[model samples]
Target chain A: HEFPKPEFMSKSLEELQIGTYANIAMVRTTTPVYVALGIFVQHRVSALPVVDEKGRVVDIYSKFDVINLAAEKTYNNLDVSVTKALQHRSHYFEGVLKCYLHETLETIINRLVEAEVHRLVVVDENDVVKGIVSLSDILQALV
Target chain B: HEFPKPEFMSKSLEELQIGTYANIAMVRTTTPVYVALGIFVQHRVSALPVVDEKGRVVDIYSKFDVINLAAEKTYNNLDVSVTKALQHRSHYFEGVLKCYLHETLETIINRLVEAEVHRLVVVDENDVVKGIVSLSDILQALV
Candidate 1:
């Protein structure tokens, strides 16, 4: 089907030369979940992928996962495992917003707004993360 | 002598009727900084204000502050307080990016870009964080 292509579709990811605003920062399954939270803040990122010891992408964590924990400070809930945090409702996001390192920004952006996510994880054909592309990054490309 | 008026000064915060995409989910001084990070993910927010029991704003937190923990794999540093985190380089904003409930969107947008912050805290004269206004929120207003 010839989907209505936006003007951005004419460009490729390599052409825009996008990278994550910050570099790649990820956590492990066994990480103290609170510490992962610390990583989010110290690093000033919106979301991060959960990687295993073998450095395989498993899931992602983001501000959408633990919203209530910050809204209601009831207990020492942050003292869990990253795996645990993700296993709970913290496993938000329909899934990690992702894009291929070679994909066009048009395809990437079309997926981004439909899923209502801010970033598209730029990856290799193997789906291992190479970097991230955010809504702001797309805006930069459009400009 | 008068300061230069920002280009957005024509509109006020009341007209914008601003609200964060995720609404106001804040943390406390005693709240573990990581917990706030979780909130950022769960609520899909980039930043949140630190408020006291009386719900008065103390400081603000953002994904930018904790961007390094995942890169360095430093879980040991998660024990720091959110207030302390803000007291450190987390204090990246020139100061808190706050506006009065009755202020203009143009004024807030001017400050948002100047401070390089994506969101602005809407507060009263007491700095009580009433709500937030993000770049998208401003964009929504503009569009």
Candidate 2:
């Protein structure tokens, strides 16, 4: 299995186990569309996982989505709700790159390419959010 | 040189090249901000080098820039030009990490981090745009 040995959580691998709260950046669905800007800037990352009360990633909120909001912002659309503001955008159409602890890196890469995502949010059999695989991590080091 | 060698141009090495234009995506200043959404989706990458008619690098436009435009989209700042909207953002501080054919990949990365620009614009002595180098390139085959 040439898969990158998945490790780290909280973005800094202090004591996070294989399947722990990624503790990476995440935004709630209720977060203002404008807030995404600060999150991106703060993390210096391009996209973030939009999560629910359970911290399950439901969609990807990116700088691109914010760009599309321009058409809406043209007419004072921001006066509306953030949920309604982001009505149309990319969701994980099977977005989560369903992978396992023992999967091959080849499969993970193929899944990412097929899903058109730069990273993957790992999920457990119970559909719980666990970890993530990113191009940044792959480029740096992978099993 | 304790600083790590972070290579690669934008995403991966299979496509990006040094002198030959890493085959990455970029945009012009006149381009509509809304277009970044489609381009980011199409290119599978984040950030584009904003160039001029002669292909000289001027600014870097990314999702971060797009985020600011949301305030402009509010119809309050609609009358402003997108160029003006994207004004005063990060460009080259020490000057575009100015590089020539004889320069090195090592130095380029140093400039990239120094300038806080994710990608470095490679140019000739005349300061004409030649190609680009990104951390993405070095990471794949980094020393």
Candidate 3:
């Protein structure tokens, strides 16, 4: 089990940073589905963290969730709320995958692989939104 | 510059295999957008390789591409051909990203990071797709 350990194996989220490609995009429960979809395009992100009025992460709305609109043949109206659109998520969805603050890259990769998810929303102990970690983040840090 | 080298670093596509969770799902140039979207849902994959009659990889139709329908506020007709739908692709799309046969995991990771893409379609000399490698694939192999 003596695998080559990258420097990031012990690195925390605060140590590995994402580019300022765009601002952190988030959505409210009341945010319209169309608006959320627009944010995905504008921000070029695959998913967004859905927050409540108090700004705590509740769920994640992803492109897959939007694609469900077509899968279920419910693309007629794009004005529905994000919470409403999330209700049609695929039955296989395993809730909002997340990683807590101060987590190392090794643990983050473990969580992602175990959950079979591409990304995890980085949150605080109180579920306050912090950032996000994705497989891309791991690869970038590794290579 | 030495770094932690995972066992997969030197492994090629043939060396790292994906589970039989599902069969390879591809779309033809003439596939309707709605049908393509359904395949994404049914297969639980984020992207599909678009092949021609000769079975050569031409393009990739991704969930992001499907999300474009909503982002552009054109979620009405679901019957358009994938080709037509691709015409409205995001300006940032860098066309179909591919990885050739015999490429190592290290090279694949470099390609993915440099291209800023989540996945790369694995192709042979004739551009016939053998498989696909995603960030998820890399994560699975790493951990």
Candidate 4:
């Protein structure tokens, strides 16, 4: 049987790229709550990873978590950055999970059922990030 | 920290109700080439599994394969059915590899890449038809 040609590993992250800007709305733990909500609605993304000054994922702010804040209209003027709204973060079965060096394609399609979010962060055993996996990855995978 | 609610698994081959046609196309081993070519062009799919009357997968016909055949002008008669044009029947891969129910979505994704095909016929060790794993299946898992 002729095996399907394996895609290049270098293309893994390339497949996940959504043509969206990154690192656009970094806010401190003391930023106003409304700012984060505004960013979420504007971007139409349900969540944002909260990163610290060193650019490490400290927590995540999601739409569901912000609903209560919005309803209550709480902390409207208070400095409540993403870290303050960081009520949750998702975890997944970890490991590099590479297929052939040139064939691995990451997408939401391959995420374990237990994962909470629609995206999976691919990382080496050392926790070094490789790229992200999402449903968009699969759409691009098809010819 | 509170976790985001995970989406329910509303889609899967196994979750499909019984008695529904498996969305499969069973073409004859000796059907004319143009018939299959028409199917590919009409469906706009990459490939279809060639199955026998007993619902056993025999070989897979892919658009690329057909294009190659056309380019080579391998068929004696342009009007011959795909099965008759399949002069090199031995060239096709027979039978299908089955994936287990507990198989991780990641494994299936890798299998899709390794097989160089978009779909896999899911079956038991007995080779009895169970369901299929398509690139769409993996995409659903991700979303």
Candidate 5:
């Protein structure tokens, strides 16, 4: 039951005129839980890349990650570090989907659909954080 | 410029045999912010319906809403009500998207795309909260 697909599937990020990931908001692994959440809310972004001391992508945090903390025994404090907050994540929670800018849209989509994640962390060859690509970005490309 | 779309588009909820929202988890407007977050995380739901005292859907609470709290100047307390937490939402944040069971898949997709929200709250004729329809659910229906 396959149908003809849009030519966008094979388009490269550069050819698509996709902007660089320079403006992506990020959080340090040491960032406090409440502060990370604040950045999330203020930026209006669905996810944030959790970086290490050298600014390499270590983990990607999403709004769901913050909600997952709610399942904890208590909400008495939110001063815990982001790394500590991640310890309370659900069992079914998989890790982040990391992608390269050199990949095509189809490759990205395949990774996203396969991982069942909403976004991918764009990383450089050195595993350094660059930007992000999301389902919203793909959908926007469609129209 | 268009290809033959999937026949599943016009399918009705009944023909598709989509399950009813009988097991949908919800919270009352008066529910504590932290408590609601616990439900959201524990239930592992993307979005939750906020009901009134009469069990009528008043609003929706998503993981993003909780993260929005991080944007607040302080994270010293989470004992406040979910209604109060909502006040801290971003200026660009629109409201929830509601849907009916009698609608077709195409209609649901159109509404989802139009609203740019991941899920739609399913309500009965009386506006009582029933269940939710998410993009994930729709995607699952695809394959």
Candidate 6:
């Protein structure tokens, strides 16, 4: 049997370099809803994280969440910032589940399935911002 | 302004949950080398664990390592089992990495890059196998 020997886990984090692991995009939590919408559409990503003034992760806004928010006219005729929309108790943000960097792929997959969301916000032990992982990333690695 | 987020440190093996994070596959290390080779070719996986009679991981055999061994064979004796060829070693065993179930996708990707491999054998604190993660899995999550 000629099974392909897999790579990636036997090594340490210092061995893995940047760009291969991190995606670079900067957007504040207060960014307008439409701007975020545009980013999601242009980048073809399912979700984007809402960061605070200090660049800490505050919340995550996914394409599906945004669509639902928009469909309910939650952002229409309101001058509320994206942060405000996310902060609203009744908004879709309540459904967002935060994950840590040390967590495993299996756990994330389960959350994705349960939450029925396409993306997850990656955070540190302090619950600070890191990056976003989408269902697309998982699928790419599997194939 | 979009500044790149600072890279977070990698998760400790202890901080990760192996069972929830990795994918598991079964293979016998004592099997003929040709049988293992065939499996590698058909599945397109990079490496596999060499298990013992009790179904425990004894050693890990990689395609890269196996290819090197195959190259040493004389043209007339290419049909030898890989197990016999590897018998000169101390033991036919491999070690696997452990991780958490809810780790960040970025962290996993970082580990993959540093390790320079495609898959990670997920195991719990007790070292029991769980599932596996691969570069292909990450790529799919991005799309």
lDDT of candidate 5 over A65-136, digit per residue (tens): 554443343433457777764564421245445777778776666555544466778788877877787654
* Best prediction by TM-score: 5
DockQ of 4: 0.02
* TM-score for the A-chain in each candidate structure: 0.75, 0.64, 0.77, 0.50, 0.81, 0.64
How far off is residue B143 in model 1, in Å? 36
Chain A TM-score of prediction number 2: 0.64
Single out the weakest 10-residue window by summed lDDT for candidate 2 chain B.
B1-10
Backbone clash total for model 4 is 16
Which of the two, 4 or 6, has more lDDT?
6
Question: Once model 4 is optimally superposed onto the true structure by TM-score, how far is the C-alpha of residue B100 displaced, in angstroms?
Answer: 4.3
User: Which parts of model 1 are misplaced by more than 4 Å?
Assistant: A1-7, A71-76, A85-96, B1-143
Model 3 chain A: lowest-lDDT 10 consecutive positions = A67-76
Q: Tell me the TM-score of model 1.
A: 0.47
lDDT of 2 at A70: 35
Per-residue error (Å), model 6, residue B16: 49
Question: Which residue runs of candidate 3 sit more than 4 Å off their true CA positions?
Answer: A1-143, B1-8, B16-22, B74-76, B88-96
lDDT of 5 at B79: 66
Q: Write the per-residue lDDT of candidate 6 for residues B1-143, one digit (tens) a residue.
A: 11111122233333433222434444675676666566665665556666666665555555544444433323413245555535534222332233355675445555544433445665555444556654334333322
* TM-score, candidate number 2: 0.42
What global local distance difference test value does model 5 have?
0.62
lDDT per residue (tens digit) for residues B54-116 in model 3: 998877777646544423423345667777655754212554377765777667666554444
Of candidates 5 and 4, the better by TM-score:
5
Error of 6 at B117 (Å): 36
Q: How high is each candidate's interface RMSD, in Å? A: 20.1, 21.3, 23.4, 15.3, 24.3, 16.2
Each candidate's TM vs. the true structure? 0.47, 0.42, 0.47, 0.37, 0.49, 0.38
Q: What order do you get sorting by TM-score, best first? A: 5, 3, 1, 2, 6, 4
TM-score of chain B of each: 0.76, 0.64, 0.77, 0.60, 0.81, 0.56
Go through the candidates in order and give the clash count of each: 28, 17, 0, 16, 2, 74
Whose lDDT is higher: candidate 3's or candidate 6's?
3
What candidate 2 gets wrong by more than 4 Å, as runs, is: A1-22, A71-88, A94-100, B1-127, B130-143
Evaluate model 4: give its lDDT. Answer: 0.43
